[PDB]
Design an enzyme around this catalytic site. Structure first.
Site, PDB file in Angstrom:
ATOM      1  NE  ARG A  81      -3.642   2.329   2.375  1.00 24.64           N
ATOM      2  CZ  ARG A  81      -3.453   3.351   3.197  1.00 24.64           C
ATOM      3  NH1 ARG A  81      -2.539   3.264   4.153  1.00 24.64           N
ATOM      4  NH2 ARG A  81      -4.189   4.449   3.068  1.00 24.64           N
ATOM      5  CG  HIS A 124      -0.956   9.258   2.828  1.00 27.06           C
ATOM      6  ND1 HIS A 124      -0.945   7.900   3.092  1.00 27.06           N
ATOM      7  CD2 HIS A 124      -0.750   9.874   4.015  1.00 27.06           C
ATOM      8  CE1 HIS A 124      -0.733   7.710   4.385  1.00 27.06           C
ATOM      9  NE2 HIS A 124      -0.614   8.890   4.968  1.00 27.06           N
ATOM     10  CD  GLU A 169      -4.270   8.159   9.052  1.00 27.99           C
ATOM     11  OE1 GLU A 169      -3.398   9.033   8.892  1.00 27.99           O
ATOM     12  OE2 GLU A 169      -4.140   7.213   9.862  1.00 27.99           O
ATOM     13  CG  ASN A 297      -5.354   4.004   8.417  1.00 25.45           C
ATOM     14  OD1 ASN A 297      -5.428   2.938   7.777  1.00 25.45           O
ATOM     15  ND2 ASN A 297      -4.758   5.100   7.933  1.00 25.45           N
ATOM     16  CE1 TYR A 299      -0.190   3.598  13.408  1.00 27.27           C
ATOM     17  CE2 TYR A 299      -2.245   4.463  12.532  1.00 27.27           C
ATOM     18  CZ  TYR A 299      -0.949   4.017  12.340  1.00 27.27           C
ATOM     19  OH  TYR A 299      -0.398   3.999  11.078  1.00 27.27           O
ATOM     20  CD  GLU A 376      -1.741   4.705   7.915  1.00 25.05           C
ATOM     21  OE1 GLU A 376      -1.867   5.493   6.949  1.00 25.05           O
ATOM     22  OE2 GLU A 376      -1.415   5.087   9.063  1.00 25.05           O
TER      23      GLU A 376
END
Length: 469
Positions: A81, A124, A169, A297, A299, A376
């Site tokens: 990616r 991005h 994002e 994504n 985290y 991600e």
């Protein structure tokens, strides 16, 4: 002892990948026709980036892609990616740059030749600076320029690339870049942020439709999503704060894409702050094109309170001390008290089970959620190269395996997760944090550009190999 993820019999067609972004790895920042992105311009501003670092060289992927592709193969990845840089493909928003398209064409060929599936992201964060001078994402025309850019890239790569992501994002490039001031272009204007939210959505919808017309097989969008956990679930002040955070962070991006509407409570929260004014008839119909996958994504999730912080509190960890604002337009009063949880080198809490919670909630609340990919997931811990020439990063490895464990449990819960991409393939330019914050499963010595597969990278390869023949 091994993790669940290391022993699980993963689906055979589960997609194992790794991810990067153009601005973060390419370098060649002003060569081969490329001109300033919003990030190149931002990085000249004092206080913008840790250590005064910039994006000119990075890890020089532009000149090392062939060898970076060989590393992907040695890892046994199914897919890669990456993003194409608008600032490189249409420098200054002027004329298309054939040198830029040619690089991406050479990259895609290397990938395919080595049996690696290209997963392309169009945006991005590297809008050309010249388009920001005309208002950037505050300007509705930018949505239509993106549309043309999308077609330009597809003309070149569409014969070979089947997986297309419009944005990565969008919350970051909108709220964090136009309201918080941490990200390029470093603005702190709520009205500008909400305008950016809508025009990115519109850009997403225009591009999805056109790419579909041009025959792109799988089209989607990647969102950083969270769980807004009330610090005290028995407290209506925290529940209200959590609602407002869930609305801004998750639903403001999920609902227009998947439901063709902004949430009613969100529209009330941001009343008079500039969202309604940029919405034109037919916009939400355009935004809510069918998508073939949703990239998630994630985290860590968020612990939310509506009260001021209690006194026993760790200092914020921030990339620089430049003056900044809350990204939570209309809800800047909300706070995020600490939880009893470990943290990465960036001060980010680590809560793997939060991934499971997130995946389950998406599955339950959106009746026609498309197939999910974790586009991600990763961690930044400090790395050193031993005298033996290895990188021992057990905390990064532990983070990855633990979050893979959560994915396994999500799959067993009935969630349709079809792939996982570790962020990042390579240590790189972590935006306002600069190069000190390493995310790679592959280490890069910034003096010699030599790559070194970290132990987490070897552990990851070993997991894939046990699930690939």
């Amino acid at each position: 002892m091994n993790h669940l993820s290391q022993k699980f019999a993963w689906p055979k067609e589960f997609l194992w990948g790794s991810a990067t972004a153009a601005a973060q790895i390419e370098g060649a920042g002003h060569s081969y026709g490329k001109e300033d992105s919003v990030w190149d311009a931002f990085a000249r501003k004092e206080g913008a980036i840790a250590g005064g670092e910039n994006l000119e060289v990075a890890v020089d992927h532009y000149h090392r892609y062939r060898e970076d592709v060989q590393l992907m193969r040695e890892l046994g990845l199914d897919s890669y990616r990456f993003s194409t840089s608008w600032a490189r493909v249409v420098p200054g928003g002027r004329t298309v740059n054939p040198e830029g398209l040619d690089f991406y064409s050479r990259l895609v060929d290397e990938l395919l030749e080595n049996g690696i599936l290209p997963w392309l992201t169009l945006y991005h964060w590297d809008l050309p600076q010249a388009l920001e001078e005309r208002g950037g994402w505050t300007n509705r025309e930018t949505s239509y320029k993106f549309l043309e850019y999308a077609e330009t890239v597809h003309e070149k790569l569409g014969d070979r690339v089947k997986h297309w992501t419009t944005f990565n994002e969008p919350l970051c490039s909108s709220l964090i870049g136009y309201a918080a001031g941490e990200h390029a272009p470093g603005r702190q204007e709520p009205q500008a942020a909400l305008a950016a939210v809508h025009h990115q959505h519109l850009a997403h919808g225009l591009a999805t439709a056109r790419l579909r017309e041009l025959g792109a097989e799988h089209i989607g969008i990647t969102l950083n999503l969270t769980n807004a956990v009330p610090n005290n679930p028995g407290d209506p002040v925290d529940l209200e704060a959590a609602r407002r955070v869930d609305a801004l962070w998750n639903r403001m991006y999920l609902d227009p894409v998947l439901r063709g509407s902004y949430p009613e409570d969100l529209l009330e929260d941001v009343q008079g702050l500039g969202l309604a004014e940029v919405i034109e008839a037919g916009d939400l119909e355009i935004i809510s094109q069918p998508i073939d996958f949703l990239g998630v994504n994630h985290y860590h999730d968020d612990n939310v309170s509506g009260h001021p912080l209690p006194a026993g509190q760790p200092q914020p960890v921030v990339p620089t001390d430049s003056p900044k604002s809350s990204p939570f337009v209309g809800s800047e009063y909300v706070t995020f008290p600490a939880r009893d949880l470990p943290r990465t080198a960036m001060g980010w809490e680590v809560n793997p089970e939060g991934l499971r919670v997130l995946l389950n909630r998406l599955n339950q609340d959106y009746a026609n959620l498309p197939s999910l990919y974790i586009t991600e997931n990763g961690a930044s811990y400090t790395d050193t190269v031993t005298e033996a020439g290895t990188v021992e990063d057990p905390e990064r490895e532990e983070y990855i395996l633990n979050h893979l464990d959560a994915v396994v449990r999500a799959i067993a819960d009935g969630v349709d997760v079809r792939g996982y991409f570790v962020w990042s393939l390579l240590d790189n330019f972590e935006w306002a944090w600069g190069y000190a914050k390493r995310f790679g499963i592959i280490h890069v010595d910034y003096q010699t550009q030599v790559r070194t597969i970290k132990n987490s990278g070897k552990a990851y390869a070993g997991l894939i190999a046990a699930n690939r023949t």
